[PDB]
Amino acid sequence: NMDVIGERIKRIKEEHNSTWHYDDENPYKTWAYHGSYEVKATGSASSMINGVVKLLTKPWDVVPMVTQMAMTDTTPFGQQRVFKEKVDTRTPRPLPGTRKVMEITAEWLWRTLGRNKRPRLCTREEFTKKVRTNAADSAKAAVEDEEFWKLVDRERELHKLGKCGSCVYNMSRAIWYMWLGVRYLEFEALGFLNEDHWFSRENSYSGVEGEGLHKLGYILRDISKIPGGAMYADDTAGWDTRITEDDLHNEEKIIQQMDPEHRQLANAIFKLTYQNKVVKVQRPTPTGTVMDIISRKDQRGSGQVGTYGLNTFTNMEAQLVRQMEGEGVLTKADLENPHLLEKKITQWLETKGVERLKRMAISGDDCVVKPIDDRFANALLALNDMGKVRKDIPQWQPSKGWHDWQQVPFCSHHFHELIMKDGRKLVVPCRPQDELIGRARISQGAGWSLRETACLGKAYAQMWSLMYFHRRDLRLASNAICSAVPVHWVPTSRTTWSIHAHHQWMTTEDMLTVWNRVWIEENPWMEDKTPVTTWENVPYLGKREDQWCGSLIGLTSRATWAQNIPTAIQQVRSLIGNEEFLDYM
Ligand SMILES: O=C(O)Cc1ccc(O)c(-c2ccccc2)c1
Ligand SMILES: [Zn+2]
Ligand SMILES: [Zn+2]
Hints:
Helix content is 46%, strand content 9%. By secondary structure, the chain is of the alpha+beta class. Helix 5 crosses helix 15 and helix 8 packs across helix 9.
């Protein structure tokens, strides 16, 4: 293993030779531990509270989920505890027959995904534009420095030689440029998967990349129209830890469709940074805090460019395999067989594969499958054997599916069909309300002015106006936040890093105009393009559904807050000062 990773550790060892030591009482069991060096204190045991959102959501000061979110441990102590849980494990190797099916399915899937698109290298300019648009700090400074790009060139030259010297994944500018440079090289070689939308629904059939949260429910309702069994949405326990060396070698097959110069750089990313990896992990000690240098040959690096797409790929593959087993194409004897006949697997893929892909909605480790019947519920041999063991259920207990797409969990949400006063239907995203309120009450980091705090609060409010307007308490709180924050103040900072967030709320444009554009004009499931002229015509969930999904409507504390919200708004206004405000109540 040292032939591939040695140079990287050598550069860390040499850079930190002042404090480099081998801590013989390190906690690593399944990862190779190489050494440690002293560092400063990074992360916090608690998160800063957004005073603007908190002041305007008084009834939720007494809500347990809201309090839990106000915590989240990011210190070296919190980093170590989550590591032991799933990260520090080994996945048993799949059986030979299982490995054969995965190989036939991966080959077929990559050809299918590349039927119209050709892989290509991503550029310094694309990465720069991406860094810039997402920064509006030290990443934008690095991108504007010519010396960073000269380091990129030097690392690339090693990659072309099949060597790596600085590509280290993490759990002043010297080590920082090595990290961003590692991400740029990864982006250069594998970025086409995201940039050229290989996992869009049109390209992948099962994929939802670029669709947006506002389209996922409609996609689930369309899947519900396909004849078959129940809709299954099984959660895998720590998906990234279950990515095997066999999965990595199947994912690598995309390089076969690349141009020689691209193939060379993607192969270096696959072989030196995915199939071999050097990781930095913070750890507290009685002496203080150290940074551990560890390595392994399998699993997925969660904070990588290709992670989403390669997880989507491997999950589409794993679900097709489960679908085959449910249909009796794959038996127990087939999975143990090192001489498994390809014919019936190839025939099923060529005749049914695309139709079987359309029965799914797959976003990384998140999947929804509507099989041809319910034999799938008990088709667990290949799923467990591939290492994709379901969370919190005995390995061999049949999966429980749903007969109503509206009950199906997907991407931390469920989706409701609403009837508007004019008879038109909307399919909206929803989640337990405490999770939405709890998230909005948190400000990222510290040292943020009231101005910056109010603008993030405004971002949360406008996200609720656009995605969660159907929740009575969220429309009320949203109107209260937007009434309390100056009209011309632009929402700054993101409400989420979700791949499904299109951030249509990151504006000073009128929210009802934005609502109309998203839900009416640009909505392909809205045949009638008549604009909604008032929020009075923007529907709510049925009162009972709003309550089942966490609404405090019907409670006294809620009626008191609603009646007295102009007072709290006026308090936020007086602390912000003499600015232009609009009353949305
Ligand atoms: O990415 C995921 O798996 C789910 C997820 C999580 C958090 C979110 O804030 C959102 C989200 C909210 C509003 C608009 C778009 C996306 C989605
Ligand atoms: Zn490298
Ligand atoms: Zn709901």
